[model samples]
Target: AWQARGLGTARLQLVEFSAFVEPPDAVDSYQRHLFVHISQHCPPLESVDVRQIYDKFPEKKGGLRELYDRGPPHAFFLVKFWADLNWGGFYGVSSQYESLEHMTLTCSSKVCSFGKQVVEKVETERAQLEDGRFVYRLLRSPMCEYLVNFLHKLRQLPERYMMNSVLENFTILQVVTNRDTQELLLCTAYVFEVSTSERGAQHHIYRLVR
Candidate 1:
């Protein structure tokens, strides 16, 4: 819409996925998941507002006054409306959402777990790079699909995860790594700086720093 308004694309390039784990082999074996998000921009404000949500939990420094005690600046989160888990029922998103859609779902009377749900399609697109190379992007993953399916069942929790609430949501463009995957997951967020060189208009210009 920015282009339509003469504001340009006003786009964000973010990369999410992958993380570091000790011993490397135990990538997915976790009793409780320690959450961390890799993004070009901090998640939108809606996820981090609840100061009273978890007060009694233990702490490292000043006590678990917030989720930040655990790790990676706890990113965006949404609370389900019906208490249904795994992206089900209604819930509140921790950030502002610009889009939504209605969907229909059928379920049995007794449902502990829904049966195998296959991705009817994987959203991938090809793009060009400055160098003589091509890149593929995962436009939408199963997560968005499930989130949309739960549709009307979600809401936003009024909160900002970052101590800084001004950070805006940016679309993660791609992931970078090798024998180094998650170790470098955080590179993108720090790679760009919001630029105001255009005066009143604002956007992120690639901060070419190494």
Candidate 2:
């Protein structure tokens, strides 16, 4: 399954699969069987979305509030919509080395309902060097696939196990930056491959500034 492949690359070593069919009769037996098979590799199989929907119920508000009050150890958020057939998600890592203050991971992907046509934008700035003035260019790439893949991974994980997983085996293309200050005017236009098994297959860009 796509979830398994994506999560496996993200370093989610252990996972469990379960399901609950609404109107039980409406569910496909094959899908249920597949879930059972997947659960063998990942045990503790049970119902699906039961707690997800239950948390919205009025009766569960108190327990939900208590959990929320504890606060998350990290900072992250994901937004998905059915109409657009597009999903975007981002997570930030805690600062470790002074050279690298922080790192953010994002993903976006094309869904069955969406088409593929991703784009990255860029701008230019001018600065003075020892020889003469030079123009620095920066690129901004849309992070649609990054958001989608990240969200997909998060959906499968229990809320408590959320952690900042390091993305590896990706190349960074320095598109542009300020000449004088050397500040990155735009730090995007990079391709990130989520699955090493499928080289150059699953990739996305981060374009938006805000």
Local accuracy by lDDT, each model = 0.23, 0.23
lDDT of 2 by residue, 30-147 (tens): 2211101012133211112223422221223222223223322111111111111111212211111011112122222212111122332233323223233221211222334544
- For model 2, give the 10-residue run with minimal summed lDDT: 92-101
Give lDDT for model 1. 0.23
Local accuracy of candidate 1 as per-residue lDDT tens digits, 1-210: 111121111221232321111223345652221112233334322222334323222223322232233323322122211111111111112111110111111111111111112222212232434344233234222234443443223223233232112222111212121121222111122111122222221233222111
Supply candidate 2's per-residue lDDT for 28.
50
Instruction: Compare the candidates by TM-score and give the number of the best one.
Output: 1
TM-score of every candidate: 0.21, 0.17
Q: Where does model 1 exceed 4 Å of error?
A: 1-136, 140-145, 155-182, 187-210
